[PDB]
Scaffold this active site. Structure first.
Site, short mmCIF file in Angstrom:
data_model
loop_
_atom_site.label_atom_id
_atom_site.label_comp_id
_atom_site.label_asym_id
_atom_site.label_seq_id
_atom_site.Cartn_x
_atom_site.Cartn_y
_atom_site.Cartn_z
N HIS A 291 -50.37 -0.16 80.06
CA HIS A 291 -50.74 -0.26 81.41
C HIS A 291 -52.03 0.58 81.80
CE1 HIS A 291 -48.13 -3.13 84.07
NE2 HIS A 291 -47.70 -3.03 82.83
N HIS B 241 -42.58 -5.63 73.66
CA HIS B 241 -41.33 -5.87 74.61
C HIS B 241 -39.94 -5.87 73.81
CE1 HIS B 241 -42.69 -7.52 78.61
NE2 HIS B 241 -43.77 -7.66 77.82
N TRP C 155 -34.52 -7.52 76.91
CA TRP C 155 -34.79 -8.45 75.94
C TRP C 155 -33.88 -8.16 74.62
CZ3 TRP C 155 -38.33 -5.14 78.08
CH2 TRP C 155 -39.13 -5.59 79.17
C1 HEM Z 1 -49.17 -10.33 80.51
C2 HEM Z 1 -48.32 -9.48 79.56
C3 HEM Z 1 -47.20 -8.95 80.21
C4 HEM Z 1 -46.39 -8.85 81.25
C5 HEM Z 1 -46.49 -9.97 82.41
C6 HEM Z 1 -45.40 -8.03 81.12
C7 HEM Z 1 -44.29 -7.79 82.15
C8 HEM Z 1 -43.31 -6.77 82.28
C9 HEM Z 1 -42.49 -6.41 83.15
C10 HEM Z 1 -42.20 -7.09 84.55
C11 HEM Z 1 -41.67 -5.12 82.95
C12 HEM Z 1 -40.74 -4.78 83.92
C13 HEM Z 1 -41.20 -3.37 84.54
C14 HEM Z 1 -39.99 -2.59 84.75
O1 HEM Z 1 -39.03 -3.12 85.20
O2 HEM Z 1 -39.95 -1.13 84.63
C15 HEM Z 1 -42.35 -4.85 81.67
C16 HEM Z 1 -42.02 -3.74 81.01
C17 HEM Z 1 -42.33 -3.24 79.86
N1 HEM Z 1 -43.71 -3.64 79.10
FE1 HEM Z 1 -44.33 -5.41 79.62
N2 HEM Z 1 -45.47 -7.08 80.25
C18 HEM Z 1 -46.53 -7.73 79.45
C19 HEM Z 1 -47.05 -7.16 78.35
C20 HEM Z 1 -46.56 -5.97 77.86
C21 HEM Z 1 -47.22 -5.35 76.49
C22 HEM Z 1 -48.60 -5.79 75.97
C23 HEM Z 1 -46.77 -4.40 76.15
C24 HEM Z 1 -47.11 -3.40 75.09
C25 HEM Z 1 -46.55 -2.25 74.58
C26 HEM Z 1 -45.47 -4.12 77.10
C27 HEM Z 1 -44.44 -3.21 77.11
C28 HEM Z 1 -43.74 -3.20 77.96
C29 HEM Z 1 -42.38 -2.17 77.69
C30 HEM Z 1 -42.25 -1.40 76.81
C31 HEM Z 1 -41.63 -2.22 78.79
C32 HEM Z 1 -40.35 -1.68 79.28
C33 HEM Z 1 -40.71 -0.72 80.54
C34 HEM Z 1 -39.48 -0.07 80.93
O3 HEM Z 1 -38.36 -0.18 80.09
O4 HEM Z 1 -39.27 0.73 81.76
N3 HEM Z 1 -45.48 -5.34 77.85
N4 HEM Z 1 -43.31 -5.83 81.28
#
Ligand code: HEM
EC number: 1.11.1.21
Lengths: 563, 654
Positions: B70, B199, B245
């Site tokens: 982000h 993810h 996931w």
């Molecule tokens: C349009 C693209 C994407 C969308 C809409 C999306 C959406 C989300 C959402 C809604 C969460 C939940 C956040 C939370 O509950 O804390 C999340 C978490 C996460 N996203 Fe994405 N994501 C996208 C792309 C990516 C990309 C490119 C990465 C690259 C590393 C990524 C890595 C992660 C990770 C590691 C988490 C885990 C956060 C946690 O465990 O607190 N995501 N994402």
């Protein structure tokens, strides 16, 4: 957007946008201006008429007078900003008079700024209409960024907001009529038929006839125009020179030798100055005399925080903290430890002046800042690092008659963030007043942060409140304030007794710190936490000390204009 | 802006609000930290769970990866602003969007590391390195890393998780995903790799608090403090989805793929919010049926993503490579030429998207031989206008917010640059290049030793020689500084697609004004002067010099306030402030004003950008400086200084 604390107000006029560079002083250039040759050019511009804007009555005199009065008629004493010496975004019909003077500004370029040129055009117009003015002083560097008795009171109030008395208000009204003593303004406004009113026809300034005190003031001028000609000279001088700082800041060969009461004058250097081997003889004499570091730093900061980097009046010079208007302010707590510091720093003055190498006499206004610097030196040496605070002596002590209670009553800080003072009548919260106070002293964000972090630990707090202090052992200049604020092990909460303070629980069992409102801002606002995280690192202990010494020295030397 | 040009954008992030001081270069500091010590600190910080933000599975790693994404996921190509190296994911405008929710408590977990180094590790660098080291700690041999993203102490002024605002349709969300990943220059294979391998780590998470932009001060800059349950951890509300996931959210394996291809994914509703897909399995709880989002499940229905993803299902090494390369491209997207990657982790292999300029392979010319090249350039028949136009066109396609483009590499001869509109390809550019190549061949064939000149140098050298000749003709015997050390890159080393964004739709320094630009020419010139990192006086002097020199579009008279062209003088300034002339919009009304010189003679001709300097109240204060009677030498010196600032702008080796 609305409630965001904007830090952009501190770097309002940076050196990046100045098209002149860093090495460019406005004091070594305007002294070389040959005003005898500049007046000829002003006369030529006044006489000629350009077709893009026709000359009213074939003379630009009145237009220049109105431009000068309107440029220096926006002063306000409550804040200080405005006036003529500023940029003020240099109406509509009074924005072409700035472009009717280009044939003069073109011949000089950098040796004559606009803020000087407009006002000098006004003054030369007065001198050309047949009037002997008081004088003129150059040196206004310009910023590079942006019914009777129903209106009579309004006139008396509008001028009262511009630091203007009653007789001088009447003089300014009568002078504008313009000032040539030929139209006979008051000579007809008092001997005319009174059936001719609003219901030749007079203007709406009939207040000067009907208002009691105004009429009493104008009775003298009705039969004694010479006193009017003399009073308008001082009124115009005050009008166009209120904004500029002390008398030592006046440049050019036209300045008059007669000093006035409203300039806050100080006696000149009537003796020799203290050398370098002797100040070290006073620092070691300032300590081992009873005064701790808290009292010394509070006293030193209490005399140099009254500065106003808008009209450049106040500051530490003159040493008026011992005098009446400031030894009675609530922020400079008089019933506390101020009547004792003042008396102690006079025995040293007497003792040193008694046994001195010839005529090396030091003044109290110098001893106060020397004591402050000695206190910081001791506090730093008590915290590992050792440093000698640089010093530029030359201040003089002003007597009681030089100062004035009425003029200094506006410099009272309604709220001083660096000392946690928070009185009454505070519309804005305690954070924005801190920002405004740091903007007045010409402080940048790193300087503001380091000054707060040093002052909290040193001991400069209103009535020695335990607020803010985040150190396990005070009387020692450390960065322990920033470390304990950026620390995330504590939990902050609003105080039980809701009065504007806070309470930092240590998380586990008890309460360690007791914060405040002008304190948690640095720990909350991201743009300032970015600086706290710089001064509160592991290695950057010496960097904090060096930056604090530099900022303290620059604050103390703020008002030093003669050197 | 509605009105009132904002000249406070030309000096934002100044040298005043900078605690480190003036004599502090980040590149001389970070090259000395023990990166192994930094790794041993980060890999220990992401293991101990703070009490004010409990760690899911006792491993903050996924949170750091999300923060790193982000922080660099806001980079937009069409202007270049925003992204990783900026560091603004820490200041007010970006830590308040609902997307970056609970990304401040993450940024405070790294304080026990930043405090240990203080100034030898920038925040904008530490965030991304923490993300990369978290990625490394879960068994993933990443590509590489390079430090050197300096922080900035002042905020500049620059996708739904359920579908098009409340429509859980993977058909609808797939196009949105493809577009919002085009906006960051990502491909389709790289987009799929990022969505899949990003993810695979971690899990997702009403009645919440305000943003830190308007949170109470006792929060200590945090926000979104929920009241449900304990508030922090095991009840944390940050996106209101609560989806997990992967089978193991703290280990790298292709477990995302078999889950997304071994179910049917009925549609359900989350406790908070709604619209998450669930199977019609068991995932270990942090402290559960297999669930997927709509954007994630879009990778199973979209035919373009279908081929790539289903191929990755069979051969996972391809995913292990593509995700590494995509991650490298992501976090280093806006950091600049490969010469800025400093640190013991930088990879040796070059990449096409880096815009690689090959290293020098000859002895560089000295300041004793260029006295012959400057003579040859000025003795080849080329006019000053041609040389200045070519040099400016070479060094005007630069983006100080992205550090890409610029004079280095000698792209002005290759395809994407020579065919643009602003630097006309009809007889103007196609003729100077031939003569410069001939001169370089003549020099190289008769060089003293191995000293060889590169064509990328000759464009700037010709510009400098032309400026020197103009200043000599005006009446000043000056010399313009020049520092060699540029190289020429071949055609197959330039991504034709990646330079289409660099085309200047409006260049105020050459009176070029195309189509599709929202703002008028004045604001476009201001934005251009902001991109090149120019202050107000530098912009004013550059415009005033380029007008008189003759570097206009098609050499139009719109701006040449001079009857003595080919002479670097301040005649653009003194004649602009000439109040004896009256302006008038032309009857053609093509945006080209004209000044009737007193009686009836339309002597001069202007443009909406050439008249701002004489109209804007605060920008005329600079024209009145260089327009004085004596400030001709000052103007010439300032123009030379600004010209060097523009020329030596992409030079990071020197
Ligand atoms: C349009 C693209 C994407 C969308 C809409 C999306 C959406 C989300 C959402 C809604 C969460 C939940 C956040 C939370 O509950 O804390 C999340 C978490 C996460 N996203 Fe994405 N994501 C996208 C792309 C990516 C990309 C490119 C990465 C690259 C590393 C990524 C890595 C992660 C990770 C590691 C988490 C885990 C956060 C946690 O465990 O607190 N995501 N994402």
């Amino acid at each position: 957007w609305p409630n965001r604390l904007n830090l952009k107000v501190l770097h309002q006029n940076p050196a990046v946008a100045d098209p002149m560079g860093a090495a460019f002083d406005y004091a070594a250039e305007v002294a070389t201006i040959d005003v005898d040759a500049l007046t000829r050019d002003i006369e030529e511009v006044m006489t000629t008429s350009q077709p893009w804007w026709p000359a009213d009555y074939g003379h630009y005199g009145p237009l220049f007078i109105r431009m000068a009065r309107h440029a220096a008629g926006t002063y306000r004493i409550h804040d200080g900003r405005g006036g003529a010496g500023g940029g003020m975004q240099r109406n509509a019909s009074l924005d072409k008079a700035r472009r009717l003077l280009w044939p003069v500004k073109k011949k000089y370029g950098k040796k004559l700024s606009w803020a000087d040129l407009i006002v000098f055009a006004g003054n030369c117009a007065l001198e050309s209409m047949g009037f002997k003015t008081f004088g003129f002083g150059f040196g206004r560097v310009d910023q590079w960024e942006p019914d009777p008795m129903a209106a009579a009171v309004d006139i008396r109030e509008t001028f009262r907001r511009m630091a203007m008395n009653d007789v001088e208000t009447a003089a300014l009204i009568v002078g504008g009529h313009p000032t040539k003593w030929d139209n006979s303004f008051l000579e007809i406004l008092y001997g005319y038929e009174w059936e001719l009113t609003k219901s030749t026809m007079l203007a709406t300034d009939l207040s000067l006839r009907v208002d009691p005190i105004y009429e009493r003031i104008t009775r003298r001028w009705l039969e004694h125009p010479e006193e009017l000609a003399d009073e308008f000279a001082k009124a115009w001088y005050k009008l166009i020179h209120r904004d500029m700082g002390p008398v030592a800041r006046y440049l050019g060969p036209l300045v008059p030798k007669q000093t006035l009461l409203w300039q806050d004058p100080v006696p000149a250097v009537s003796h020799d100055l203290v050398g370098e081997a002797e100040i070290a003889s006073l620092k070691s004499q300032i300590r081992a005399s009873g005064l701790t570091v808290s009292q010394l730093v509070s006293t030193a900061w209490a005399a140099a925080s009254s500065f106003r980097g808008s009209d450049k009046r106040g500051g530490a010079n003159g040493g008026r903290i011992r005098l009446q208007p400031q030894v009675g302010w609530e922020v400079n707590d008089p019933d506390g430890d101020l009547r004792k510091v003042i008396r102690t720093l006079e025995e040293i003055q007497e003792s040193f002046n008694s046994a001195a190498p010839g005529n090396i006499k030091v003044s109290f206004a110098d001893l106060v800042v020397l004591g402050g610097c000695a206190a910081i030196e001791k506090a730093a040496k008590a915290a590992g690092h050792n440093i000698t605070v640089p010093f530029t002596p030359g201040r003089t002590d002003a007597s009681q008659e030089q100062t004035d209670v009425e003029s200094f009553a506006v410099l009272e800080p309604k709220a001083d963030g660096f000392r946690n003072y928070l009185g009454k009548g505070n519309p804005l919260p305690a954070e924005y007043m801190l920002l405004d106070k740091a903007n007045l002293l010409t402080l940048s964000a790193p300087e503001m942060t380091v000054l707060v972090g040093g002052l909290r630990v040193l001991g400069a707090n209103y009535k020695r409140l335990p607020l803010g202090v985040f150190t396990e052992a005070s009387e020692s200049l450390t960065n322990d304030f920033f470390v304990n604020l950026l620390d995330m092990g504590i939990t902050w909460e609003p105080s039980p007794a809701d009065d504007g303070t806070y309470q930092g629980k240590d998380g586990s069992g008890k309460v360690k710190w007791t914060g405040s409102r002008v304190d948690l801002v640095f720990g909350s606002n991201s743009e300032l936490r970015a600086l706290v995280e710089v001064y509160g690192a592991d290695d950057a202990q010496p960097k904090f000390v060096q930056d604090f010494v530099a900022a303290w020295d620059k604050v103390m030397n703020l008002d030093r204009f003669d050197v």
